[PDB]
């Protein structure tokens, strides 16, 4: 029936508790979605080649060239935190919970409305929007994960974060195969090193279409489509962070002489000459036992050739690393590599009353200290005669290849059978919730984009389209653009994401850090006088935990 509703709008969050300190977090999110008809109905193969920008020596990092297939379909992506939780709910989860699991995911399209536009062309402009009761919305749930997986969070193109603001879906595309070469240069190189695009090798060509791969459901103004509950198989996420680095693993040394009064200068003292200390160290050619040299079970965190760019068939990319700097929490200028930087707009946090195309940005300084401080590292000759002479220590200040601003730490890697490192923390609201595991024989230990990674398979994507509303002058033999009636669809979307979380327990005499409203952050969680809203980033691993 045209005049009957097919679904209920619900954006509530429910915390049903259970025995043993577990809570089932069911987060319902609903949105009003606005979809126009695609610019064209044809699958386009398009190439980007920013030769002008990259031809300038030393700008190789700015390479954007690639190949993609532009489809007539739009993607509905709810794989971002803000789609599901409001600031208060996040406060609750992060302050009261210790671990978080992923359980299930549903979504449905209900109350489909299709409308057509007529413009009068009269000297005083005017137009009319008319209903099209027989028009249809094409819906295709890629339950088998046949299409390439394209998580919209990386581009900040997911659904919106406010229930009361309608949201649009994103034009869907996927990568083609391009062979591209770009020899790096500097401001000072002669001429122009090779910046060439080669094309496609026939053995890597994959032209997917939704129509030929997924069932298509033709929803009229009175139909509905429900995906069906999916159940996850991810590993747990932790809402607590580790402070213990290698220097803090194990039993401290006994202090044979202790302070006798309170004072900034009243330090303690181990009390035994260093070459006379009992203990165990891996450095077999010295008798000095020191906090820098005493054995530890393993390595917390690892060093990587940070800002390494590595070239493959498709061009240079930045070597991703798991965690960022240590101690950067006290200075934003030292965010450096590892810690992500999010750029986003008014659907996803930026003060909705801001003009212009500049996006709000934040860098997410993590709470966990599985990091490194390169300026303090040093490699010294094996002899270990101390104090070390100029020739027997490589310092972070020394040149590599004669480049005064490239030190050994930039080409350094300390990852081994001993590396203990943690998973990435969730980033509210612009972070990703889940990701698909690569279909490679040997798989990565973690993803840097999402906390939850999927073992076997996980939820299929949803693609939407407006059916061809042909005029009476259609002619499939015509080479011109197909003449369509301008049509657009507004359909409601409701999703349900179920989480399982554990309630934390107080383990220490002292209070721990929590997210709290204060006279500084106050106006970030209430609308402006003219009605503008924003969502500021929030931490997720405030509570510390014991690594060892």
């Amino acid at each position: 029936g045209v005049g009957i509703s097919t679904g209920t709008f619900n954006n509530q969050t429910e915390f049903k508790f259970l025995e043993n300190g577990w809570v089932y977090i069911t987060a319902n999110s609903s949105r009003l979605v606005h979809l126009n008809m695609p610019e064209s109905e044809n699958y386009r193969r398009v190439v980007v080649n920013n030769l002008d920008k990259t031809a300038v020596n030393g700008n190789m990092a700015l390479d954007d060239t690639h190949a993609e297939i532009v489809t007539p379909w739009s993607l509905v992506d709810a794989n971002a935190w803000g789609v599901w939780f409001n600031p208060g709910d996040w406060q609750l989860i992060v302050n009261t919970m210790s671990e978080l699991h992923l359980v299930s995911f549903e979504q449905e399209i209900f109350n489909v409305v299709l409308k057509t536009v007529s413009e009068s062309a009269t000297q005083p402009p005017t137009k009319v929007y008319n209903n099209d009761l027989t028009a249809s919305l094409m819906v295709a749930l890629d339950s088998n994960n046949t299409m390439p997986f394209t998580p919209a969070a990386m581009r900040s193109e997911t659904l919106g974060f406010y229930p009361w603001k309608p949201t649009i879906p994103t034009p869907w595309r996927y990568y083609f195969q391009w062979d591209r070469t770009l020899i790096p240069s500097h401001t000072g190189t002669s001429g122009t090193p090779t910046n060439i695009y080669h094309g496609t090798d026939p053995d890597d060509v994959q032209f997917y279409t939704i129509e030929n791969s997924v069932p298509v459901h033709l929803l009229r103004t009175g139909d509905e489509f429900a995906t069906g509950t999916f159940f996850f198989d991810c590993k747990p996420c932790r809402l607590t962070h580790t402070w213990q680095t290698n220097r803090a693993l194990g039993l401290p040394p006994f202090l044979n002489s202790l302070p006798q009064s309170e004072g900034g200068t009243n330090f303690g003292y181990i009390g035994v000459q260093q070459d006379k200390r009992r203990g165990v160290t891996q450095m077999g050619n010295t008798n000095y036992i020191t906090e820098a040299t005493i054995m530890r079970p393993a390595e917390v965190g690892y060093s990587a050739p940070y800002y390494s760019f590595e070239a493959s068939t498709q061009g240079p990319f930045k070597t991703p690393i798991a965690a960022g700097r240590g101690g950067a929490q006290t200075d934003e200028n030292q965010a450096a590599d590892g810690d992500p930087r999010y750029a986003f707009g008014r659907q996803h946090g930026q003060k909705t009353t801001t003009t212009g195309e500049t996006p709000e940005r934040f860098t997410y300084i993590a709470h966990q200290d599985t990091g490194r401080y390169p300026e303090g590292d040093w490699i010294q000759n094996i002899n270990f005669n101390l104090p070390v002479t100029d020739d027997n220590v490589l310092l972070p200040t020394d040149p590599i290849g004669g480049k005064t601003g490239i030190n050994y730490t930039n080409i350094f890697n300390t990852y081994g059978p001993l590396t203990a490192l943690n998973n990435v923390p969730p980033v509210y609201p612009n972070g990703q919730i889940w990701d698909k595991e690569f279909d490679t024989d040997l798989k990565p230990r973690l993803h840097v984009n999402a906390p939850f990674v999927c073992q076997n398979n996980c939820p299929g994507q949803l693609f939407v389209k407006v059916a061809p509303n042909l005029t009476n002058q259609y002619d499939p033999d015509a080479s011109a653009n197909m003449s369509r009636i301008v049509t657009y669809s507004d359909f409601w979307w409701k999703g349900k994401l179920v989480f399982k979380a554990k309630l934390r327990a107080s383990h220490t005499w002292n209070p721990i850090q929590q997210m709290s409203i204060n006279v500084d952050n106050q106006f970030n969680y209430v609308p402006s006088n003219i009605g503008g809203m924003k969502i500021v980033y929030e931490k997720s691993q405030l509570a510390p935990r014991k690594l060892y």
Partner: antibody, heavy 126, light 109 residues
Framework: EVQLVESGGDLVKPAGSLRLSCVASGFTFSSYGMNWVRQAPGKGLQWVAG???????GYADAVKGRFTISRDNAKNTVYLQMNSLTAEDTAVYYCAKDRYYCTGDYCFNLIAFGYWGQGTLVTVSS | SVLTQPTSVSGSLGQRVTISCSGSTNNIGIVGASWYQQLPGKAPKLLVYSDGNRPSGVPDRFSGSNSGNSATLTITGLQAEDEADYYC???????????FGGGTHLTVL
């Protein structure tokens, strides 16, 4: 860039008290210690006091037990209550901030650096 | 405690000049000197850190050195604008207090 401002210096009678104020902007006031340094007309420098983020305070013997320094982290403001002033305290007073972030009791109040403010003059006489 | 300094020093335009400061194991021998410059009637501005580095915008002319219980500052390419009073600074590890030197006046000829 780091900016500091000071106020409260004035001519005052011996004994009694006087209260200086220094304000800051451009840097994370919480993570850095704040110090006062003074210089008499045409004479050398002399560190007065410093206060780390946690409320722990330090003083030089010339004032230890006479002055009391403090912070208001919510306003990037530091205060120096100068009780029991004497003629020898006549000097110009400057507000400084250490280079390296630091907090707690064991934290050196001032090692090397500070974008010293314009300063405030103080005279004790009657 | 206090750091010793020379009373005054002189140098000709375009020539190099040196200034010295002396301390003890607990002030200079542990934490290096930091050199400050004070213009007439103005608040002092630092020249060289104990780290050996200079703040942003400080001319390359200045540079510092340290040896045992003493430190030293030098100016290369002395200029007329460099005529100012100078002070060494350190930290007495025993008293936990910043120790400033006696000051020195540099004359440009």
């Amino acid at each position: 860039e780091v900016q500091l401002v000071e106020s409260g210096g004035d001519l005052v009678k011996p004994a009694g008290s006087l209260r200086l104020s220094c304000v800051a902007s451009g840097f994370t006031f919480s993570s850095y210690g704040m110090n006062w340094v003074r210089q008499a007309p045409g004479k050398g420098l002399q560190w007065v006091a410093g206060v780390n983020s946690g409320g722990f305070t330090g003083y030089a013997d010339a004032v230890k037990g006479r002055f009391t320094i403090s912070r208001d982290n919510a306003k990037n403001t530091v205060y120096l209550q100068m009780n029991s002033l004497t003629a020898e305290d006549t000097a110009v007073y400057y507000c400084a901030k250490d280079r390296y972030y630091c907090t707690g009791d064991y934290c050196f109040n001032l090692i090397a650096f500070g974008y010293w403010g314009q300063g405030t003059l103080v005279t004790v006489s009657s | 405690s206090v750091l010793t300094q020379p009373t005054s020093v002189s140098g000709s335009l375009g020539q190099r000049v040196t200034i010295s400061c002396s301390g003890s194991t607990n002030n200079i021998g542990i934490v290096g000197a930091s050199w400050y410059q004070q213009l007439p009637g103005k608040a002092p501005k630092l020249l060289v850190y104990s780290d050996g580095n200079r703040p942003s915008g400080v001319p390359d002319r200045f540079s510092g050195s340290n040896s045992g219980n003493s430190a030293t500052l030098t100016i290369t390419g002395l200029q007329a604008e460099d005529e100012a009073d100078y002070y060494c600074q350190s930290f007495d590890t025993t008293l936990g207090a910043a120790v400033f030197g006696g000051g020195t006046h540099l004359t440009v000829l």
